């Protein structure tokens, strides 16, 4: 069932369609993994020009290669179905205009994923936005909407797509869908949930005849946060340079500082930051080169980091302070209070930097992918000139999907490449099987002093987690001093954007059992 889907799988599809008379053909093939829940197809109609718009077919032309995360992988019915498939029907009502009817079987014919449909089309207007083509071509994102039919053995979804119309409007097409399987084997019946779908519509320029290509990601969820970031921007000049942090709380006793790593910003601190500063006074800089602090024409390297935040610190006079770190945030945090000890009054801490000793402890599904970062040519290509860190890496370390609102507030400090340094010399400082050597030694040092430290230490983790494995988790709460784990469910490398009410809550409540 699910095993046929843990590589790149090769996709055709053929459909036959009949709409107020018209009929057509449409062919496709490209190739789908689950592991991102990604699509790359084009598709070109066989007889001709298309006589409806290309948008309008994006549903009926494989949801078996949605993403469905480890703690829902019992309630993925397109899967289980596999390989002898199962039947999808729908019936698609365009919002006073016609209507299409499909009926439509995903099976595994040799070794390629196949999608042949029947589709047929009447009660259309003739000046309507679909025969008369007043679609533009692109795509919205949607929430699909499942829930099993016990009764046929399938499924039942629904859900909306909207259409955008030239001239601004919107065309609604309510969706109808029901899947039941072919073979007779056993398949899951879910709970109730839904997949967050996008999809990008684009042209291949050497392609001569009536194509469309797709870009699709799907990602599961509804079975187990706010987007806004209202906070006041604040600017202090360090080093010749200005660097933007936020400021909270009330101002005397001890500041709590908030360090981000790649490729956030203090954006990810955005929902744990209510439940500090109703006690606690919360400083969130934005690290140099990143966020709206400003971004000069440095090599970024971990020490450059080191440099600022150092002059940061003293630049607001601050004297203790407790540390709420996670990825190099916490390389940052870690150093500086290995090297001002009687200034640290509690750490709390979350998928941090560690010495990863071999590289069968990265996550196997990317540890390609952060190989392939970790080169002058083909990394840079991909961080500096894709801006794959942000579109890529970014997405699939949240279990959750993100909305394009935030997508869009990490888009902004990196929309000139030329800003993207940061984002390229962030994974080569890794220290990842001995390289590089001086990370390695650095970060060796303060995780030696962390062991020999009593100040107090809250450690949030998740699973599977990227940088601390769930096995690593528990090995450090229990041999470093003071330390208290929480486990905040399912998550990867951004917990905060996961369950940021327990991160925050527990950080809430952790902060007054200490001495400040
Ligand atoms: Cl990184």
Avoid at 185 to 208: A, F
Avoid at 360 to 388: C, H, M, S, Y
Wanted: glycine letters at 8%; charged letters at 25%; hydrophobic letters at 35%.
């Amino acid at each position: 069932g699910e095993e046929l889907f843990t590589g790149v799988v090769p996709i055709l599809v053929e459909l036959d369609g009949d709409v107020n008379g018209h009929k057509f053909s449409v062919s496709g093939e490209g190739e789908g993994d689950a592991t991102y829940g990604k699509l790359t197809l084009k598709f070109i109609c066989t007889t001709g020009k298309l006589p409806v718009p290309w948008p309008t077919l994006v549903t009926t032309l494989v949801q078996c290669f949605s993403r469905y995360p480890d703690h829902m992988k019992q309630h993925d019915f397109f899967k289980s179905a596999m390989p002898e498939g199962y039947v999808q029907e729908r019936t698609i009502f365009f919002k006073d205009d016609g209507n299409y009817k499909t009926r439509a079987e995903v099976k595994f014919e040799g070794d390629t994923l196949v999608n042949r449909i029947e589709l047929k089309g009447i009660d259309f207007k003739e000046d309507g936005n679909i025969l008369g083509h007043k679609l533009e071509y692109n795509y919205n994102s949607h929430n699909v909407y499942i829930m099993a039919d016990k009764q046929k053995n399938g499924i039942k979804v629904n859900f909306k797509i909207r259409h955008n119309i030239e001239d601004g409007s919107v065309q609604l097409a309510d969706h109808y869908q029901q899947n039941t399987p072919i073979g007779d084997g056993p398949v899951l019946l879910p709970d109730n949930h839904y997949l967050s779908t996008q999809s990008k519509l684009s042209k291949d320029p050497n392609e001569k005849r009536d194509h469309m290509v797709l870009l699709e990601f799907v990602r599961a969820a509804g079975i187990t946060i706010g987007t806004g970031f209202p906070f006041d921007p604040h600017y202090v000049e360090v080093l010749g340079e200005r660097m933007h942090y936020v400021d909270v709380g009330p101002r005397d006793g001890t500041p709590v500082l908030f360090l981000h790593g790649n490729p956030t910003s203090s954006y990810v601190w955005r929902n744990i930051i209510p439940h500090v500063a109703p006690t606690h006074r919360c400083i969130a800089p934005d690290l140099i080169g990143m966020g709206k602090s400003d971004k000069p024409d440095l090599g970024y390297f971990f020490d450059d980091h080191v440099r600022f935040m150092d002059a940061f610190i003293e630049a607001l006079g601050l004297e203790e302070v407790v540390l709420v770190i996670h990825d190099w945030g916490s390389a940052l945090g870690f150093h500086w209070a290995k090297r001002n000890p009687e200034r640290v009054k509690g750490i709390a801490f979350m998928e941090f930097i560690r010495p990863i000793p071999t590289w069968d402890e990265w996550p196997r599904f990317a540890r390609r992918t952060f190989q392939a970062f970790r080169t002058t040519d083909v990394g840079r290509k991909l961080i500096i000139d894709q801006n794959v860190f942000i579109e890529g890496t970014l997405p699939m370390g949240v279990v959750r999907p993100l909305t394009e609102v935030e997508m869009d507030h990490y888009r902004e400090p990196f929309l000139n490449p030329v800003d993207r340094e940061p984002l390229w010399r962030f994974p080569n400082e890794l220290p990842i099987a001995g390289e590089p050597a001086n990370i390695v030694a650095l970060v060796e040092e303060y995780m030696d002093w962390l062991h020999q430290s009593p100040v107090p230490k809250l450690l949030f983790w998740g699973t599977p987690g990227v940088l601390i494995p769930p096995a690593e988790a528990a090995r450090l709460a229990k041999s470093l001093p003071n330390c208290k784990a929480v486990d905040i469910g399912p998550g990867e490398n951004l917990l905060q954007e996961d369950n940021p009410d327990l991160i925050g809550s527990e950080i809430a409540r952790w902060l007054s059992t200490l001495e400040i």
